[PDB]
């Protein structure tokens, strides 16, 4: 079987070595301009065009939990890949202990006002502050999904009220699932901490704009993990200026690298984590995916399948 | 019975009134300056000398974890605690919960290395950073206590190296324990993150040094959350100026408030909090100072006395 390989920062000769070795009836090779020969299975992020243009391949592994991009590139050029082929994506892969860690240590900085105390550190100002209560410390996620499962159950687990919002219903002992657009306003009613783990789609594209953040209490937080589009970065400085939001930390943006430009750089109560929450482990990716081969040429149940109609 | 209370900052009211439900048969209240009524015991925190010099009392009850408050002043002021009364603390009463809060936010926060990436947004400059493995993140716990087990805990499930160290041997699941000073530099080694929840004893006062620093491995840090007097302030600073530290969190100091002309104010990479680490939860503290005075008047054995032989 063939396989090829893309990735704009990978070592393509570690995962070259991986994958041969995970499946020794395999032949693997990078990818690059004129290569145009055969394939039956392709692992990519960020591909160009002509890499997957016409191709007859058996399925397209993407190397992250995100699909947008290449979800994207399938809709201003649907010559790129043929309805037919199945699509897949990590699910998980180490991303979730990582989520857990980034949440946890942010959920109880801001619980804990530390961003306060440095605030009044700056300054060279001595002035202890009352705590908060865990009873109006809620957690809201936006996006239930295998990230925002394993984030809200590091955090169920500090007593935090945890509710979550996503398209279907979840049952989850210890939180409060909100389904749609209908129930949206109730969900960002009593939540204190907006965490985003939502997939960046045509339907959720700046879900996190003034409209949204007038829903939220005064004095609440934002902790974007998703994507850059899905936040208006004016709309986001205007609630922080204003005290609707007491804070928020950001791990994406509307462009990577962000430009000077952008006051977020400069802004004092914006924590910003270069594009750097979650990364896939290699090892459990090759793992994942030599599996899924395995399976899809044996005809048997596979897991991680892209859902092209609904867009994630 | 006849108890005697004070405090600087509770509502001594709130207290009495506890108290006296919590004990139908006492009559308590709030002492102040001429009360020279007898008394059987005694709930202090930070009490003025003379309120307590020259005392027959069958008990003390020091409201909070830390006693080096009312022991500090015994060598000076024998007269104030005599030999046969039996002083007792806080443990834990809710403070193990905000130490693991405390601890798990920021050790995780140096870890996905929060601290350059602010220092990087204040540079309006984009650069991911290498990863830290857990191996090389290796947390040192000194003070191995009440509230040093409660923080090892909520630690070691995140699967961070731990190791602890006390003055008798601890045996704890995923924790290293080492034991006195001829395993100090050892416990040192590879402490990549130093933890001090020591109680201010004569052998303690100074340990945080220029010396005890040399012990630990580059890019380390300091989170202190017990005493001010355990940190060389000065030395702190030329170890976060010369490499050695990487940085350093601080809830206590030398003095507290802490003067405005002192140098960690501005130091950008010593995080600092107003002595809000972990305080009781009155009605924990009522629980168990009633529960333990009921024992003590039935000539029953009890937990939380302070060996006034080793100080602590
Ligand atoms: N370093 C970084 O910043 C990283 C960011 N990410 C981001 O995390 C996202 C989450 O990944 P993962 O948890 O694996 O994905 P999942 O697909 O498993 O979860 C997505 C969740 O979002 C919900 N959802 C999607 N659209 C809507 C909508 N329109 N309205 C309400 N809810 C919606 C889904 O609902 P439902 O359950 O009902 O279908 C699902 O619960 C990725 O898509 C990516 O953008 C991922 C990794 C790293
Ligand atoms: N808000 C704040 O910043 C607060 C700070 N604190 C501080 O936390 C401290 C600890 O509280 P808690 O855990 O209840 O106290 P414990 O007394 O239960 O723990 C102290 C630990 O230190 C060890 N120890 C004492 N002396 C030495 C020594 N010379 N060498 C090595 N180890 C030593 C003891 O060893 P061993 O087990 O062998 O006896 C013990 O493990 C308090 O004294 C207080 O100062 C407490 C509450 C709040
Ligand atoms: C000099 N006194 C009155 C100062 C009390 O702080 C000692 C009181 C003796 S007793 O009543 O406690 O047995
Ligand atoms: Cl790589
Ligand atoms: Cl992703
Ligand atoms: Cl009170
Ligand atoms: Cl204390």
Redesign the pocket.
């Known amino acids: 079987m063939e396989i090829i390989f893309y990735h704009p920062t990978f070592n393509a000769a570690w995962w070259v070595n991986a994958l041969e070795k995970a499946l020794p009836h395999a032949r693997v090779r990078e990818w690059k301009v004129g290569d145009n020969n055969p394939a039956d299975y392709a692992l990519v992020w960020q591909p160009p065009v002509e890499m997957l243009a016409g191709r007859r391949l058996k399925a397209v592994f993407v190397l992250?939990?995100?699909v947008?991009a290449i979800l994207s590139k399938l809709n201003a050029h649907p010559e790129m890949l043929d309805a037919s082929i199945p699509l897949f994506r990590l699910?998980d892969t180490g991303?979730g202990l990582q989520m857990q860690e980034y949440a946890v240590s942010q959920v109880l900085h801001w619980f804990r006002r530390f961003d306060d105390y440095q605030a009044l550190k700056n300054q060279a100002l001595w002035k202890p502050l009352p705590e908060y209560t865990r009873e109006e410390f809620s957690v809201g996620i936006m996006?239930?999904?295998?990230?925002?499962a394993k984030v809200a159950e590091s955090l169920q687990a500090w007593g935090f009220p945890l509710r979550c919002?996503?398209?279907?219903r979840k049952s989850w002992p210890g939180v409060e699932s909100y389904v749609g657009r209908e129930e949206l306003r109730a969900f960002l009613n009593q939540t204190r901490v907006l965490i985003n783990?939502?997939?960046?789609?045509a339907?959720?594209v700046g879900i996190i704009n003034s409209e949204l953040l007038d829903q939220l209490p005064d004095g609440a937080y934002v902790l974007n993990?998703?994507?850059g589009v899905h936040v208006q970065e004016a709309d986001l400085l205007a609630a922080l200026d204003s005290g609707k939001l007491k804070g928020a930390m950001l791990?994406?943006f509307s462009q990577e690298p962000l430009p000077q430009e952008s006051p977020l750089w400069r802004h004092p109560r914006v924590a910003m984590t270069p594009?750097?929450?979650?990364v896939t482990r290699p090892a459990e990716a090759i793992d994942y995916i030599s599996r899924t081969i395995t399976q899809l040429e044996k005809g048997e149940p596979v897991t991680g399948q892209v859902d092209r109609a609904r867009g994630?």
Chains 1, 2 share one sequence.
């Open positions: 992250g939990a995100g947008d699910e991303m996006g239930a999904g295998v990230l925002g919002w996503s398209r279907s783990l939502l997939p960046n789609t339907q959720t993990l998703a994507r791990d994406v594009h750097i929450a979650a994630y």
